[PDB]
Structures are given as C-alpha cells and as structure tokens.
Amino acid sequence: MKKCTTKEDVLEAVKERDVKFIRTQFTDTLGIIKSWAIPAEQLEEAFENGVMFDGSSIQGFTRIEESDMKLALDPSTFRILPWRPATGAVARILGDVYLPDGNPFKGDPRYVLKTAIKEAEKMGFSMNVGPELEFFLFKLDANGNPTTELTDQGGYFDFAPLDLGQDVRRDIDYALEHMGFQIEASHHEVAPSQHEIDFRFGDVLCTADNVVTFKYVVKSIAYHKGYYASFMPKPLFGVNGSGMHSNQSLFKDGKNVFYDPDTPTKLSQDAMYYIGGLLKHIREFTAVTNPVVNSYKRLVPGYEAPVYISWSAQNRSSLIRIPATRGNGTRIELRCPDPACNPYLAFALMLRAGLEGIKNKIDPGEPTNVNIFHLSDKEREERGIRSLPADLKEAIDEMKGSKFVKEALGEHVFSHYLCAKEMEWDEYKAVVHPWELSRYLSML
Amino acid sequence: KKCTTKEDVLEAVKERDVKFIRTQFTDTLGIIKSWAIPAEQLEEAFENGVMFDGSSIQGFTRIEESDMKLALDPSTFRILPWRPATGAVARILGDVYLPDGNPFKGDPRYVLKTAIKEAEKMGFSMNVGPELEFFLFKLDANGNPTTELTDQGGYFDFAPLDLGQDVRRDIDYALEHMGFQIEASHHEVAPSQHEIDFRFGDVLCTADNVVTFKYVVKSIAYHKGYYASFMPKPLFGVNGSGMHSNQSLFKDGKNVFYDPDTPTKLSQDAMYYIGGLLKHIREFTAVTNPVVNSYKRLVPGYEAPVYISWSAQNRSSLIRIPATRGNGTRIELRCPDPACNPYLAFALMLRAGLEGIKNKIDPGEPTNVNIFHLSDKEREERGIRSLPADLKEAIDEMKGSKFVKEALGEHVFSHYLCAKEMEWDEYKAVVHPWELSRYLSML
Amino acid sequence: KKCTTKEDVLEAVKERDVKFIRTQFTDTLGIIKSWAIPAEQLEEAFENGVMFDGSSIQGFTRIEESDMKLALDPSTFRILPWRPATGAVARILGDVYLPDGNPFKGDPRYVLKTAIKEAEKMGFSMNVGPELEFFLFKLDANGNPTTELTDQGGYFDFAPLDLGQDVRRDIDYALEHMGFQIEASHHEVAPSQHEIDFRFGDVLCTADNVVTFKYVVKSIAYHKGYYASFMPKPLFGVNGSGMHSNQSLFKDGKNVFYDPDTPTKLSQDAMYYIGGLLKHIREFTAVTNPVVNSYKRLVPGYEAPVYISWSAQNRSSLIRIPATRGNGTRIELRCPDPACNPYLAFALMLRAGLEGIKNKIDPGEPTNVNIFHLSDKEREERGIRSLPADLKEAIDEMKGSKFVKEALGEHVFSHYLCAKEMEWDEYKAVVHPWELSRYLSML
Amino acid sequence: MKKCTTKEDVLEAVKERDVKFIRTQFTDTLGIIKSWAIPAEQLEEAFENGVMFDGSSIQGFTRIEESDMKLALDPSTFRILPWRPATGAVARILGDVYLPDGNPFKGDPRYVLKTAIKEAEKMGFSMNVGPELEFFLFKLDANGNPTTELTDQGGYFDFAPLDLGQDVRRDIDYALEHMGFQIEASHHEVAPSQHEIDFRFGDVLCTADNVVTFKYVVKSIAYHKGYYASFMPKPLFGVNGSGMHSNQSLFKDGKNVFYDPDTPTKLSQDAMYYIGGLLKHIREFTAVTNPVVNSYKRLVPGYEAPVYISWSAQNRSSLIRIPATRGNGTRIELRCPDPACNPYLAFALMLRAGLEGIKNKIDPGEPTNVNIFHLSDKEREERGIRSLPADLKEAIDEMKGSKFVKEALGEHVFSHYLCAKEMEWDEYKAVVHPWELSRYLSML
Numbered sequence A, D: 001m002k003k004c005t006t007k008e009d010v011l012e013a014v015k016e017r018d019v020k021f022i023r024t025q026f027t028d029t030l031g032i033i034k035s036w037a038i039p040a041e042q043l044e045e046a047f048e049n050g051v052m053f054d055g056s057s058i059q060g061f062t063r064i065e066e067s068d069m070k071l072a073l074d075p076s077t078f079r080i081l082p083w084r085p086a087t088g089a090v091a092r093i094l095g096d097v098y099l100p101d102g103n104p105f106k107g108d109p110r111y112v113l114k115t116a117i118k119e120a121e122k123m124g125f126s127m128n129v130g131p132e133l134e135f136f137l138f139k140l141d142a143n144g145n146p147t148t149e150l151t152d153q154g155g156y157f158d159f160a161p162l163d164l165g166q167d168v169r170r171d172i173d174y175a176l177e178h179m180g181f182q183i184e185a186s187h188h189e190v191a192p193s194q195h196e197i198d199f200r201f202g203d204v205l206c207t208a209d210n211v212v213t214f215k216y217v218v219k220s221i222a223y224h225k226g227y228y229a230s231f232m233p234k235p236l237f238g239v240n241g242s243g244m245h246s247n248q249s250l251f252k253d254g255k256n257v258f259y260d261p262d263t264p265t266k267l268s269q270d271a272m273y274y275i276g277g278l279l280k281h282i283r284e285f286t287a288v289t290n291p292v293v294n295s296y297k298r299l300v301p302g303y304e305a306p307v308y309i310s311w312s313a314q315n316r317s318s319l320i321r322i323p324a325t326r327g328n329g330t331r332i333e334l335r336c337p338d339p340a341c342n343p344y345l346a347f348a349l350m351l352r353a354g355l356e357g358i359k360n361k362i363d364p365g366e367p368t369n370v371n372i373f374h375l376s377d378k379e380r381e382e383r384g385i386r387s388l389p390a391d392l393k394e395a396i397d398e399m400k401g402s403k404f405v406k407e408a409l410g411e412h413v414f415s416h417y418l419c420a421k422e423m424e425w426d427e428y429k430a431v432v433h434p435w436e437l438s439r440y441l442s443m444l
Numbered sequence B, C: 001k002k003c004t005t006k007e008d009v010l011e012a013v014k015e016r017d018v019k020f021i022r023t024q025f026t027d028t029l030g031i032i033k034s035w036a037i038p039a040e041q042l043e044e045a046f047e048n049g050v051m052f053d054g055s056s057i058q059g060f061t062r063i064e065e066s067d068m069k070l071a072l073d074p075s076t077f078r079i080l081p082w083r084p085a086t087g088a089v090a091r092i093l094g095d096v097y098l099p100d101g102n103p104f105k106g107d108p109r110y111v112l113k114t115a116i117k118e119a120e121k122m123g124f125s126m127n128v129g130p131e132l133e134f135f136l137f138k139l140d141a142n143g144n145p146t147t148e149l150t151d152q153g154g155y156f157d158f159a160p161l162d163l164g165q166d167v168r169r170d171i172d173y174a175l176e177h178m179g180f181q182i183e184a185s186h187h188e189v190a191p192s193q194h195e196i197d198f199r200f201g202d203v204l205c206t207a208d209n210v211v212t213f214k215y216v217v218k219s220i221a222y223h224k225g226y227y228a229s230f231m232p233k234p235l236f237g238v239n240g241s242g243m244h245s246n247q248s249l250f251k252d253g254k255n256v257f258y259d260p261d262t263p264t265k266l267s268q269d270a271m272y273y274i275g276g277l278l279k280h281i282r283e284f285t286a287v288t289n290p291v292v293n294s295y296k297r298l299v300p301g302y303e304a305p306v307y308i309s310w311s312a313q314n315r316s317s318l319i320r321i322p323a324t325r326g327n328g329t330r331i332e333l334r335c336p337d338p339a340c341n342p343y344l345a346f347a348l349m350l351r352a353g354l355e356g357i358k359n360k361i362d363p364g365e366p367t368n369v370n371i372f373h374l375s376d377k378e379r380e381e382r383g384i385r386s387l388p389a390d391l392k393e394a395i396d397e398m399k400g401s402k403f404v405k406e407a408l409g410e411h412v413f414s415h416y417l418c419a420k421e422m423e424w425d426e427y428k429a430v431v432h433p434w435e436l437s438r439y440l441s442m443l
C-alpha cells in the first residue's frame, strides 16, 4: 500500500505497479454502485481536464434525459483493487461531479455528505463513523446465478464454515486488509451463512467511500470462488436479517466531545443533544436508512432489529445504544440501518439530525432500560414510545412531509429519491404473491 | 313448492328420500360452516333444537368452547342439487341461541337480522341483487387447486367450448334446480372468469343464497375436475373478482329510490342513502374486502373502484346508478369481493344508508369523469378520498369507528378485528419471491 | 321448425325441453358474444327485453359500462345441435336499444340492417353465399389448441379417413340438423384444411349463420378431441383460409345482375356494382381482413388475391364472376378471411356495390392475365393497384375514408380503428424468433 | 335393521338376509381389534357349544404360549356389516370368553368393563357414555399404503372436503346409520383433513362395542374409496391431534344422579364426588387412556388437548368439563383420551375411579375458571395444579405403583398391559430420529 496525495503520485504508481485500467467509483441516488473504465494511458489527461460522462446515471432508474457532467478525479482516493489479472493491475478512483457551467452537481450523494461535513465544521465538529456490515454467503446455482442456498448452519461467532467456504471467507478478509481497510473484527453472525465485518472507526467521508468499495470487492471475490455475497436486509424468513449498525461520535480540537468524565454516564451534554436530534428525526429518514421493500421484513419484532424509537446504555435491542467504552472511544450506535442504504445519504442525515439536536438543545428523555418488546401497547403508549415506519410506504410518507430531510438532501436528491421509491412501492403492492395463493386459493 | 312448517319439511324428507340434513351457517370471517344430521333425527331437532359448539362461529380466534343451540328454520330447508347413491341431501339454516335462552349476538346472521329490524322500524325493507364473479381453474395431477386456465375468452365471450362448456352449464342448471332463479350468467373480462347474477330479492334470503352458492358451485366444479375460485385476485395483470351489490329500499310495495318528478328520477332519500354509504364506506372496507388479496384487486387500472365517488354515467365509480327506473331503481356498490361475509357486508351497507336517510347526508355532486385519468392535484381540489390501500389501513379505519362497532355488536367487532390483525401480522413478515427477484442480485 | 311468434318459441321450449337460452351477438371486432338465460325467464324476456352491459359490444376498448336492452327476435330462435343430459339448449338473437328507447347504432347487426334499409330504398335486396375455409388441428395433452396436422390431404381429397373422418361428418350433420342447408363441403388445398359452402340466402339471415357456424363447429370439434381454427394463415408455406362472399341483388323478384342479351350475359348494374367494389375495397380491407395474421394470407403465390382487379376467367382476381347465369348470377369477392365481422363486411360490400350503381362507376376492362406473372411497371400502366400489405396500412386507408365512416357510423368507425391501432402497436414492438434466427449470429 | 334376542332370532335373520360369513369381534389387551370368520352353516353349532379359539390372541404381542379358550356367542350383539359383497351378506357378533374349566377368562377387556358395571350395580348405578371420536382422512399412495397426505385444507366445522372426498365422508356417515349407530353429529374438525363423529349417548357396554365396530367399519369403507382413516393421536406436527372426549353420567331408578335442581351449578353431590375420584386417579391410568408413544405428542400445551389436571364448567380446555345441559342430559366430559385407547379398559377405569370418589366422598376442590395455560409454574404450584404424565414412560411408572388400577383391571390384564407398553417404550427410546440428525449432525 501507499498514500497518494498529488496526481504525480498516482501517475508514478500507475507505471511502477503496471496499472492498466482505472475504474471510477460513485453511486446513484439510491446507492447502486456506479463505475466506468478508463485506460491508464488516458489518466494523465483525465487529471488535467476531468472526464465528461452522462450524469443522468446518478439519477437512478428515474433518469428522464441525458445530462453532460464532469468528473474531477481526486488523487488521494486512488486505490489498487485486490485482484491481479494477468493483463495488469486494476485501481479505483473517486472524484467530484461538476456541471458544464462549472458548479458542483448537488445531486451527487457524495456532495450531500460533504455539505453535511461542512455544517459540522461550522460548529467546530468532525464526525467519525464505524459501521458493522452484515451479509450472507450463499451458493450459486448450476448456471452461476445467486441463490439463498446455505453455505453453513453455524450461529453467532461460530468458527464456520470449515469447508471450502472457510477459504472464501478468509480470502475476503485478506483482500480488505490488502487494500488498507484495517478491519477491526470479522465473525459469523446469528443466522446461518451470515457474516459480519467491523470497519475501522474513522472519518465519515473516507468510511463512506470504503462502504461502497467494500460491497463490490466482497461480491467479486466471493463470485470468483463460486459463492454469492448478499447484502439484502432479509433474504430468509425466520432467521436474522442483515443490518448496518452505525457507530459515530463528534470530535473538536482533537478531543471526543461525547465524553465527559464528570457526568454519571460519563457522557457529555452534547451527546445527549445529539441523541435527542437523532430520536426527533429518525422516522423522517427511515426511508433512507432502510430503503427497499425488503428492509421492513427485517424491521419486525423478534430478531435483534429495533422497531421502537428509544435509547439506552444497557440493552442492545434499543434503536440507539451506548457502548461501554469511554474517553476517546465514546460513541453512540444507531442500529436501524441495513446494508442496502446509500452510505453517503444515511451518514449525512444522521450527522444533520444529531447536529440539529445540539443546536436546538433537544433533550432525549429518559433511557428505556427495559426490553420494549415485553410491553403492551398501553405500556408503550404510557411511556410515549413510538415505532419506526412499518413498511416502505409509511417511511415514504414520513419523508415526503419532512422539511428537515428536504433541507439536508437538497431538492434534486429529495424528489428523485422519493419518486424512485414510490414507483418501487407501487410495483410491489400490486403483486400477487405465492403466500396469498397458499392461504386463499383453497379457502375462497 | 315452498316450505313453511316443520311438517312440510318432514314429509318432503319422506317423499324425496332425504337421508342427510346439513346445517349451514358462517363464522365471523365468512367461512361456511356446517355439520351433518341424519334425517331420522330431524323430528327431534325441530322440537328441541340441536346443541353444538358455538365456538365454531368465532373463526380461528376460538380458544374455549361454548355450548349453543340451533333452532332450525323450516322455511330455509332446500334439497341440494346432487343425487348421491343412497338418498338425497338437503341443507337448512337456523337461529343460534345461548343456553340461557337469549339469541347469540355473535352470529353474523343475527347481525343482519338486527339491521333488517332497524330498517323495519323506519318502515323500509331492503332488496339486494349481487353479481358474483369467480374463476374456473383446472386441478393438478393430485386433484389440488391451481390457477391454470380453462379458456382464454373475454367479456361476454361464448367460452369455454370444450368440456368446460359442460361444467359451466352444470353450474347454471344446479342453481336453477335449487330455485335460485338466476338473472344472467356470462363470461367476465379475465380469462377463465365467469359471472352469475342473482335475482333481485329480500336481503336475508339473498345472503343465505350467497353462502349456498359458494359451496354448491365449488362442489359441482370439483366433481367435474375443475376448481371454482372466489379469490379477489388470483392472477396478476388481469381483472379481479368483485361482488357488486345492487340494492334498493321498499316502503310496502313502492321503491323509495324512485321519484318521477326529479330530473334524474332518483328521490331525495336515494341521495341520502348514497351519502351515508359514502360517509362510512372507509370504515367497513375491512368487511367488504376482508383478506390481504382483496387489496391486490383494489389497485388502479382494472375497473375495480379505488376512489370514493358516485355517478349515474361512469361505471368505474364506487357507487353506480343503473339506468333502470320505477320499481327496478337501485344503486350499485362495486367495491366488495366474494370473499366477504354477505351477512356483515349487507348489514353495514343497510345501516350506512339508513344513517344517511336519518341524518340527511348530502352525497355531493357526482363525479362524471374518470377519476383514474385525473391527477392527484385535481382529486384534492374535488375532495376525492381513496379506499384503504391494504388490509392494515382498513383494519385501522374500522378499529376506531363508532358506527361499525354499534352495527356489528362488540362481540363480532373485536373478534373480527382480532382475526384480521393476526392475518396481517403473518402476511407482513413474509419474504416474497418478488423481493428475491428484485434484490438478491442487486444488493 | 319455422318460428314466427313468441308463442311459437315458448311452446317449442316447453315441448322440446329447452332449459337454457343463449343470446347471440357480436362485438365491434367480430368476437362472438353471449349470455345464458334460464328458459323459465324467457316469457318475461319476450315481454320486457333483457338488460345487459352494452359495453360488451364495444370490444376490448371499453372503460365505462352502458346499460342497454336486448329485444329478442323470436324468428331467430334455433335449437343448438348438442343434447345435454339436463335438457336442450337454444340460441336467440335480437336488437339492442338504449334506455331512451332508440336503437343502439353501435351494434354491428344494426349496421348491416341500415345497409339493407338503404338497399330497399332503391328496390334492391341482397343475397349472399359465403364459402368458409377452416383448419382441423389436434389438441395437445392438456386439451389446448395446436397446429398439429390431422391429415396430409389436398384439394377435394377424400380425407381424413381415420377418426377425423367422423368429426368432419359430425360437423356437417350438426349444421344440417340446425337448418343451415349446406350446399357442399370438401377438403381445401392445405393439409388439414376444410371448406363449407352456405346456401345462397338473404344477407341478414346468412350473416347470423356465419356467427353461429363458428362456435358450433368449434364446440363440435372440441368435444371430439380436435380444434377448428379460423385463423387466416395459421401455417407458413401453405394456403390460408378465406371467406369468399358470393353476392347478388334482386329487384321485383328477378336477378339484377343478369341480362340475357349482353355478350357476357351480365347486366349494366352488375358492372356498376363491381366498380363500386373496386373503388372502395382498399378503404375497408381492414374490416374484411381485420387481424395482423390476415396479411400473412395476403401475400403473392397462393389462392389469396393481392391485386385489385376483376375477371370472368382468372380465379386469382379480387373479384370473379362465376359462370352461372340467370337467377343464379352472382359476383364473388375473394379477399375476406373468416376472422372478419360478417355484419360489417357484408354491409360495406353492399354499400360499395350500391354506390357503384348510384354513381354509375365503371369497373374498367377485366384483367384476364395472371397478374402475379407481371412486372411492377406492367401493372403500373394498366392501373392495377394492390391491397394493403399489412394491418397498419389498411388502418390508415380506413382512417381517412368518408365512405367507411358514413356506412359504419362515427361510433363503430372510431371504436374499430382504435382497437386495431392498439393491436398493431403491440405487434410492431415484438421481437420475433425469426429475427433471432437471422440476426443473432450475423450481427 | 332389527333387534335380535335369541339364537333363533339370529339364525332366522341369517337365512332371510343371505348372510354367508359371521365375524367374531373382540379386542386384545392393547385395544387392537381381533376377529375370525365363521361360515354361516357353522353358526347353529356355535350357539350350542361355543367356539374354541387361541385365547393367547387376547394377550397382545406379549403372548408367550397358546391357551385354548371358548367364545360363547351373544345373539343380541349380532349386527350385519354395511357392505354387500356379491357372494353374500356379512355380519359381526360378540361374545364371552371362557376357560376350559368353565370359568370366564378375566383377561378379556370386555370382562373387565363388565365387572366395573357390576360394581356400579352394587351401588345402584348404571353408566351411560357418549364418545366423540376424532380421526383423519388421508390419501393412499400409488401402492395403496396409508400416508399423511391431506384430503382437504378445511378447519373447524368447515363444509369440507367438496371433491370426491365429500362422497367418502358421506359414505362413512351413511354406513354407520345403516348399522343403527344413531349418530348425533358429524363435522370437520380443527386440523386439515380431520373429522369428528359424535356417538349416541347410551349404555357403556353397548357403546364400547360400537367404538370397536366404528374403527374397522370406517377404515374399510374409506379404504374401498381410495382413502385412509387414521386414529393416530397426533399424525401431523403443528396441527391439532385426535382425541376421544368421553361424556358420561350415572343413572339410578331411571333418573340422572348427576343432576340436582337445588344446587347452584345444578349438579348433585354425587357428581362432585364422581369428579373428585376421576381427578384423584387420572394420573394412574393415563397410560390406558393415552396408550401409545404418539399419545404424548398430542398431550403438549397449545392444541386443545388438556395437560393439566383440573375441572371447570366454563372453559373447555380443562381436563374435566361440564356441558351446559342439565336435567336428564347432565354429564361430565373427560377430554384426555385419544382414539388409540382400549374403550373397554378406559371406560371401566373411568367408572371405577368415579365410583371410588362417591364411596369415599372425595371432594374435587374449587373449579379452575381461568385458562391454566396462561399461568406460571409458581401460579400453578400455588393452586396445586398437577400435570398429566409427559410421556408414556412416566404414565407407565404412575400405573406400575397404582393399587387402584391393579384392582380394577385384575392381575392378568395389569401385568400384560404394562409389560407390552414397557417393550414399546424401550424400543422407542433407542431410536435415532431424523430430527436429531438435522439438529446435531452439522453442529457436533
């Protein structure tokens, strides 16, 4: 590995490491990973004048017309991919999207996260994020297509699988380390064939880039060993779903502003306000953290995924959890998102909501130290404990009337995101599922 | 002939060689319930009633038993339209009584009777002619139901013309054997979809016939190798099956919906009846459209009503006024599907219209445009609301409805809602193959 | 077996034990439509008419209902040629009326009646004998239609001689048993192809029989394990199926087309009648050849005509004069296929021929040369035009035709064109396997 | 039909109805239905001298040696079977088993019920019984063997099935009525393809004979229409099991001794004592009412089968239930037995236990009007609510040390029953089931 800073740094590394193709990396509004290939010979001119490309690719499947846009490559994002083709090495690079008139394109989710970072800098804060990505490892069918066929029957923290799946699982870990991911931990998860990789706790912009890189790197490596890596929230009924727990904290003057040695919980007042802002707005952008119809098959009671809006320091099954670590490691964990979400939009909205809590001094209320799943509607109503949206349609409706989400995302991203999700829901709600035939065909 | 007394039924049992009597009733959710009585016990049954487990009326939300007595109604005795090897079979209905002697208020038939009583207090009787649409599918190798088609015909097509032509004819002839007096039978819009229109008659008699219709058609089709489906929407991309409910009020021989002196020839009370129906239809859509599959039919683009409006010209309105006037003046509510309990559905329709007449509920200007063609902005300008989009929303609308609670009684109200909530919670957690097709390769 | 009054029908229903009556009508596109009436309700139907959804006539382009009334014509009563165990079945036709009492102008049968009415203004009555060609195919294991051959015979061959010999005989017997008075039946050119020639009768009665013929032959074949197909061109490389229409005009009981002293013994009005047919045929080919598959039959090299011409010698001309003279003098239009709506096709043929007599339209000199053997420039000099080469071209020629719009009425005209356009817009986007076989490896 | 009283009655009916073969009917110790065929020509000599047969057939599968025994035919039990072979009519007949020395064989379960009836007559009581027999209707495989393939998917009191299964279901009802069973009701039961037939409330000895006749008549008729009738307690997991609810009451001087118009529940003191005796001894003979290993897959919480020892008048889910009917129809319903039990032994022990309650004035305690399934072990322990045996081994152990069951059954039946059930359990407990492979093969 190495750290590149100038374009001259990257151009040198291309020659000495025989990099033949550079892959751009970005995401559309919905989080789908987008890319195109540039020959390494073209790279020097790309750094000088940028690269024209069809920016309607960022709109998602709701793109109406073409839109010429410029990608200004960022040399510090240049990273060599962990596979070695016989032809030559391959690397990825990120960048900033500009309109023909020279202004940055506000529709790029990466730009949205960057303006959220700028709002934090105005109040003197920088945000660090450590995500915990759960995924499934399935077998491919005889034609190479993904299935939900299990690769092991192990459980939480099991040393599984121990067949050829042990090697692909180890190959995934090795390649992430080969790219400088600095993985914290990787283990088996609760559901069969389910796995977790814990990212290094680091800067939000760099971490968000790594989440996108993580997805296609794991998928490509699993693919080449005969397996499929799934980031579906809930691919299998009756077992755990896959979430993306998002640990986060704010820093100012190189000090963790969530830690206070004097207070009882050893948490500062800013952390309380940050939690309050998260609890105040979480319903309005659940459609961003849980973006697909399948997301709400995971957001059901009984499988470790939080469906009630609360915070606590003791039990994990709360929406917001405080890990025991204090001092510089003080953080709060938001446990609702799933790996289908766009990391740029999800991290940006978490930051904006938390910052909104700090600037308006939003009290988070008492923590709920009991397991809310053991309570009645009356007991929940007595304590005023609200639910997350029960399906994508409800989350869409809560996001449609949120002035907060519109300001944080911008009009272009806001309408394009909602329009795409509405078409997704309208298509889903009309489908006659086999479950309905099994229950009703004989009966009616 | 017509049966009126227990002596009429008993001699008909001797004369037609009836060996088995099947009782007929429904639970809260509309599932048809029955048990078999040997014909020789029929005399004792008329004299003392029949003890049975009334917990069968609860539906699948039953936990404890409850001894109940069925008092047979001799006028409901009817011989079933199939002739077994040894003796004919007949069905009979009755009134369910608690051991203390009071009528059981949880019986859906009793619920319709109280609604009839409410209309009688006002001097009205309700006539109902329902239009029942069903699908005719073939059976698989093991005799199990499928959704595999029997024809590719369309609206009013003379189809099927293969062996399916015979089973369709057999169904029509069986209903006529029972004295149904069908008005029409024809092919519907979707492939393998058929419709049978009932005679316009008294609501209590009609509701009894809808229940009888369902298992009679299913049994006749089964014994010919076919399956009759009353699912609201068994197939994607084609029409669903509804149960349009033409209804009318009569004040001792006169149709109160007719008025020769108004321009539309509809009376004021017909306008109020529509107003009450429109005011409350959201509150009991869970009764007219009771299963999860019901709301795959209530989607835009298939002539099933989605928006709440009335008209005399556009058919795709929630409430349609047919052209016929005079004695045949009626209004047609087009949202219900054949999965609904006809006793509860007709009772709530009657109460809502009666409430409109009592409270002079203006129905507003008719929507003479296709609301489907309009945009969401115009709908708000015209104040056009929608029917519930799924069973959960319909459950929530009914949950806080004083009108529905009073009309059904608190027994049926809670039992019906509890069953539907359990049904929804099971459905909502299922991971469907559609999700795998869309997201397994994408995420 | 001649029915004239409603009392004639009612007595025959009672004597022959008819239990179901089937109405018979067609929609705008020629699909046969029907609904069933129990015979007990037949007497009320004769007195008051039968209310039904008139949008069924509109085709598949319907969105809104329209309540209409069918006034039954007792002279069209006819018992169907199959005998259910329950009882006999009969068909009946009638006229469609709006609720206001006016005849519905959108019924194709009404469109034919107006052409008959305009012909009577000049003292003309039209007789037609249609020659209907169809295919007899096998059913697959599931009873679905296929194009599997039932014989390999040719023109006028005594084939098939296996069990297919019995179904062909059963078809002929069923038609004779129903009073059709078939003239001849024989094997057609293509394998498994068959032709049945109708008696020369009045246009209205003949048109009703063409509709009845189609579902009778269909049902009889189905119940023997075979499929009767009326597709124009179900099989590439062999003859298509046409519906040749021999027609003649009568005035004062004598044949208008016959003239004993003329060289060809053809009258001046016969020449004018052909001229009107030739002048307008391009404008309503979309009616005589209504489906996309119709123009796979209208390709050069087979019996189907693709060039607008007439002759008394060549077969392959669009219009041919049979050698028969006197009372049997007739002209034969050979372009239609059995998919056409007979009411609309016969009406437009009559109107076009009538416009020829009204306007003294000269038909030109006959083309006695096989036009297929000619170059494009040869036909250019002789003014020989061709039929539209696909459905879209036929639609465009009909779209801008004052003659067709007036003869059908603005409602039938609009609805027919809108449905056919939707048809073509679906077909034009399909990627066919032939394209895959030709271009996948090449490009 | 007709009622036969003398041997001359039966012999006449044989000639006029062309009965060609007579089938004896009895049961072994475990309830398996036993029979052998007698030609009708032999019948007259059979009434005169009896029929020698191998009485070790009554011992069950624990028969060690042969034992010559005599069957004295009972003419009043002669009944013509409801099928009509082309060869000739067929009838069944019961009788009494005698040893070569002329004494009745005490090992016949029918004798055991008869001595229980004699104990009731000593105290002036006669017992009436109405059983409710649940059974399943399954499809046969391609070779004609029983399966658990469903014939319908209907539920409680559904009008199902409506295909050819509607005819076999109706054929079963018709044939029972053709034999003079006088069926009270027949309906669909809770589980798919499950059905119930309610017997006429009548004399215990006659009713017990009918239960045995019912089983092979239903099975034979279902068999000849292509179906299988199953009396397994729990053939399918996750749905209801099949029970044999046993309604009963005592009569003296033609009056129902369970009815008292003066008491609050309108139940006499004898009924209270009768319930007390049943509750006192039910554990000791659960092995008789629930005799097979499969019986205790039904005796699990949650599927209408009672697992706790209690009585009540309101909720059915009690072990003993009082129906609402009073006066001459006053009865108590015992809901634990399943149709696998021997009716002679089960009815005899219920009678003996109830009579023991009356003679010792055993108070039944307060009724438990709450659903016991909603209670903790502590709440159940506080009210002293005991459980039924949890498996056949536990029931065997409770029966092995019961002086009451030994006296009521006799030594021969007692040891032979227990020895057979112990061998049944020893064979079962050693089997390695597929469930164990599914759970442990991958894990260990």
Ligand SMILES: [Mg+2]
Binding pocket: A132, A134, A189, A196
């Ligand atoms: Mg985890």
Ligand SMILES: [Mg+2]
Binding pocket: A132, A245, A333
């Ligand atoms: Mg965590």
Ligand SMILES: [Mg+2]
Binding pocket: B131, B133, B188, B195
């Ligand atoms: Mg309809």
Ligand SMILES: [Mg+2]
Binding pocket: B131, B244, B332
């Ligand atoms: Mg209608």
Ligand SMILES: [Mg+2]
Binding pocket: C133, C188, C195
């Ligand atoms: Mg020909």
Ligand SMILES: [Mg+2]
Binding pocket: C131, C244, C332
């Ligand atoms: Mg010809």
Ligand SMILES: [Mg+2]
Binding pocket: D132, D134, D189, D196
């Ligand atoms: Mg039961």
Ligand SMILES: [Mg+2]
Binding pocket: D132, D245, D333
């Ligand atoms: Mg019971």
